[PDB]
Design a protein around this motif. Sequence first.
Motif, short mmCIF file in Angstrom:
data_model
loop_
_atom_site.label_atom_id
_atom_site.label_comp_id
_atom_site.label_asym_id
_atom_site.label_seq_id
_atom_site.Cartn_x
_atom_site.Cartn_y
_atom_site.Cartn_z
N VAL A 105 -22.99 2.28 -25.20
CA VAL A 105 -23.69 3.26 -26.02
C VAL A 105 -24.55 4.13 -25.12
O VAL A 105 -25.32 3.63 -24.31
CB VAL A 105 -24.55 2.56 -27.09
N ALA B 60 -28.63 5.86 -29.16
CA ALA B 60 -28.57 5.28 -30.49
C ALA B 60 -29.17 6.26 -31.49
O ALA B 60 -30.29 6.73 -31.31
CB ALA B 60 -29.32 3.95 -30.53
N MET C 121 -27.17 4.47 -36.63
CA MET C 121 -26.90 3.24 -35.89
C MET C 121 -28.06 2.27 -36.01
O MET C 121 -27.85 1.06 -36.14
CB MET C 121 -26.62 3.56 -34.43
N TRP D 203 -20.16 0.71 -34.83
CA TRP D 203 -19.15 1.22 -33.89
C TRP D 203 -18.39 2.39 -34.49
O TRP D 203 -18.16 3.41 -33.83
CB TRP D 203 -18.23 0.07 -33.50
N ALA E 207 -20.60 5.46 -34.52
CA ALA E 207 -20.68 6.04 -33.19
C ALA E 207 -19.42 6.83 -32.86
O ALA E 207 -19.51 7.91 -32.27
CB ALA E 207 -20.90 4.93 -32.15
N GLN F 41 -18.77 10.26 -30.74
CA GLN F 41 -18.48 9.67 -29.43
C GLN F 41 -18.93 10.57 -28.29
O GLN F 41 -19.51 10.09 -27.31
CB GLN F 41 -16.98 9.38 -29.32
N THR G 262 -22.50 9.91 -28.13
CA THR G 262 -23.00 8.59 -28.49
C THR G 262 -22.39 7.46 -27.67
O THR G 262 -23.03 6.41 -27.52
CB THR G 262 -22.75 8.31 -29.97
N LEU G 263 -21.19 7.64 -27.13
CA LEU G 263 -20.47 6.57 -26.46
C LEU G 263 -20.05 7.01 -25.06
O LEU G 263 -19.84 8.19 -24.80
CB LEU G 263 -19.22 6.16 -27.25
#
Lengths: 412, 412
Positions: B270, B273, B277, B330, B333, B337, B340-341
């Motif tokens: 991550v 956040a 989330m 998940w 997120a 993405q 966020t990821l």
Amino acid sequence: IQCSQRMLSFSDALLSIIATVMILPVTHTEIDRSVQRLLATRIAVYLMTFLIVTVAWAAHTRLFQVVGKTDDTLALLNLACMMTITFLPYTFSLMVTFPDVPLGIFLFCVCVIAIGVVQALIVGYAFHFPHLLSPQIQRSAHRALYRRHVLGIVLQGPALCFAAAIFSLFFVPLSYLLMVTVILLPYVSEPLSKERVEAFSDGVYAIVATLLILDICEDNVPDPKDVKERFSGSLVAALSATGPRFLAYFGSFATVGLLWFAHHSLFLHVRKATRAMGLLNTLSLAFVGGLPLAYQQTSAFARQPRDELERVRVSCTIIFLASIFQLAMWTTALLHQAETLQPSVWFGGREHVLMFAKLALYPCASLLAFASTCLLSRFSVGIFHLMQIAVPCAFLLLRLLVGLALATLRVL
Amino acid sequence: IQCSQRMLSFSDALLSIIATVMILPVTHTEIDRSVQRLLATRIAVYLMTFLIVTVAWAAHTRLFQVVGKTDDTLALLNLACMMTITFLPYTFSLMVTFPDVPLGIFLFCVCVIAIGVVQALIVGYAFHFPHLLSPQIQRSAHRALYRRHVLGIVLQGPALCFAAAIFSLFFVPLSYLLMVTVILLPYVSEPLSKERVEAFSDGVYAIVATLLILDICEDNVPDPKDVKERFSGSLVAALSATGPRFLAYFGSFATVGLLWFAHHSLFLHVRKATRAMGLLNTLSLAFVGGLPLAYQQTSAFARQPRDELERVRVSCTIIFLASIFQLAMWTTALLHQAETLQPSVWFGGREHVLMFAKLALYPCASLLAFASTCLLSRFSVGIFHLMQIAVPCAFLLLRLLVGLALATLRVL
Ligand SMILES: CC(C)CCC[C@@H](C)[C@H]1CC[C@H]2[C@@H]3CC=C4C[C@@H](O)CC[C@]4(C)[C@H]3CC[C@]12C
Ligand SMILES: CC(C)CCC[C@@H](C)[C@H]1CC[C@H]2[C@@H]3CC=C4C[C@@H](O)CC[C@]4(C)[C@H]3CC[C@]12C
Ligand SMILES: Cc1ccc(-c2ccc(F)cc2COc2ccc(CCC(=O)O)cc2)cc1
Ligand SMILES: Cc1ccc(-c2ccc(F)cc2COc2ccc(CCC(=O)O)cc2)cc1
Ligand SMILES: [K+]
Ligand SMILES: [K+]
Ligand SMILES: [K+]
Ligand SMILES: [K+]
Ligand SMILES: [K+]
Ligand SMILES: [K+]
Ligand SMILES: [K+]
């Protein structure tokens, strides 16, 4: 490969919980020789279990100093290791409660062997995949000798405990001798991760500060039936009947929070933590765990002057033991300041006197209250309460007080 | 000036303890309509107190996002803030137990007002010494408007609770309406510190994993007198009489540890956040807190097939609720993405399928066990145990299983 910081933070949280688990029987002891003997036994068991779990935690910390980076398999193996470690307090209590029964000592030895075997699996996995090792180990050409040394260190305890488990069926005293040898050998014959020390200390402090509110939230919410029958429907009266518990919680939380404040301030200026600092930190935490009992005893406040005098002496002694070891950590660091402390708090540094005052504030107050108990016995109890008010304020005004003392000594 | 990381870690530890405090009455409930009603009331109180303490924790996290760096006075004010927050569960329980008594609602409102006032003092101190603020606030020319906005946000809750406290003497329902409005306004009308979220989650997981061993270490060490009288001096028999408690602890620790493993893996990837989330994480933790009850119920194992079927269904439902919200984090997120990821787990990334499998392993297993309970009722109980064995192994072999599935779909 993954960063291992959060996994070790979780390990520290679990280990602090497990180390402080055995303090609950002490605080739940309602409190004639039988009661005193029971309390002494419980306190001794708590201290021994705390020390054992701290030894396990230190072994884990240096194991994962060897293992630089983590992995899914390493994370699951660490979970298994924590699971095994969580059984040390119960098995130790079972062994001490049944010293002559071989089953208890066998179960304790099995727990120790399991911890060691899981750690040996971790070491083997990490060395089979060298990119999980720390760069120092990775770049070394003697990785095989490093593996042998680390694995021997890991499996030392399990071998002795296995021998003790065998001997329990034949000669128990030798089994106990081997168990104590397990702890003796590493220390009777290095730096420690400061982050691990800080996390463990924070966990212990957080648990100890909130022990009494945890008890209150469960036991001391008035029952409407009891309120209506015994207090004539007056909720305020029912809540006043439980005032001493709230006062005990207030005092215990304040003292533990301010001891944590002193610890935090001390470790903000630490460059590296040595083994001596770790041992002194362990002793200070072990004695910190006993503050809730002291404040419960003082808040119960039996009107008998001798009983209350004893309670005040015990509380002051516990506070002194909790804080003198922080002061001893600071003094030990001052011996190698050049490598152990930031230049701010070296001898003659900008904040040296402030750090000294911050760490000596509590030992001096506790010693003064204890002395007043012998010289000013009649006022001593009140003086104890005065202490609970004076020390927090002194922490707020500490810089102003230090400046005032410096100005006064300038002319004197 | 000082680094604020350790102070906030201590805050997270204390707040996790306080949030999970009210789970102890649930797990200590021995378990006809009266008992069910008592358990339902306790579970509802636990959920509400957990949510309230989480709201307080989130407010604290963003307050100290505003305050970039800490100080001795700020550290002591934070200690006072934590002291005030530690009373929320008790005052809420007192209020709900005595809904018609104005004193309970007044005490809850006083606790909320005190939290807000301490936070307002922190804000005022930080803004009077701008070097304690975050660089974004420091460099802004509208520091006065920032102060006004932050202080209004901090004091919003206290004003509503003060109005509710006044109204309790005149019209209680409006007082309750205002209390709920306190929580409604912030969310009905931003990023969250990932470190704070991780620390809070780790604390909650560590507490929940060890709840049952904490109970065992206190209650379930055999008494030598009882061993000699009731078990004919056989310690092994006395320990076998308490086997179900150990099985419950083993299951609960394994499930909570593997849920933490999934959470850890998710948050290793991550970048930032979001608020959604955070809300989903809060829900997942709240439902995770209930696993020890599920495993206690299943280990007690009343021989009646209907009772055991109900207890398997309840346990599977609790596990599904605990894990579906991680899967929902998940999935949420994946919608952003890009910000966020990490690129590793983006759609079509190297580790995307592995992350998906890791987070969906538990919901699928729980749903399958629940379905078996309706289709394969006679075997279902055994299947539940099979689950407890299968899921850990699947976690160990997860990469091999994912590779096998990928290879199989390559041809299919
Ligand atoms: C039997 C189960 C339940 C628990 C005990 C496991 C036994 C088999 C394990 C635990 C630790 C192990 C020891 C660890 C280290 C050494 C030192 C080496 O130079 C010879 C083998 C020896 C002495 C091992 C023998 C096997 C051992 C004793
Ligand atoms: C009396 C003690 C025990 C607890 C209550 C403290 C009172 C005096 C405090 C708590 C929060 C405060 C409020 C916070 C914010 C505002 C908004 C502002 O535009 C007018 C004042 C007002 C409305 C404050 C008035 C005083 C206040 C209500
Ligand atoms: C002398 C002795 C005896 C028993 C055990 C033992 C036994 C049970 C167990 F589960 C784990 C262990 C130790 O765990 C490993 C040890 C080595 C290896 C790989 C070897 C290398 O290359 O160094 C991998 C794992 C170890 C040493
Ligand atoms: C409208 C209102 C009413 C009551 C209170 C109040 C009351 C009691 C208390 F303890 C703290 C507060 C709020 O705490 C501070 C507020 C401002 C300041 C400095 C002013 C600046 O420059 O912005 C410092 C501290 C606040 C606002
Ligand atoms: K930590
Ligand atoms: K902790
Ligand atoms: K805890
Ligand atoms: K507890
Ligand atoms: K942390
Ligand atoms: K924690
Ligand atoms: K009981």
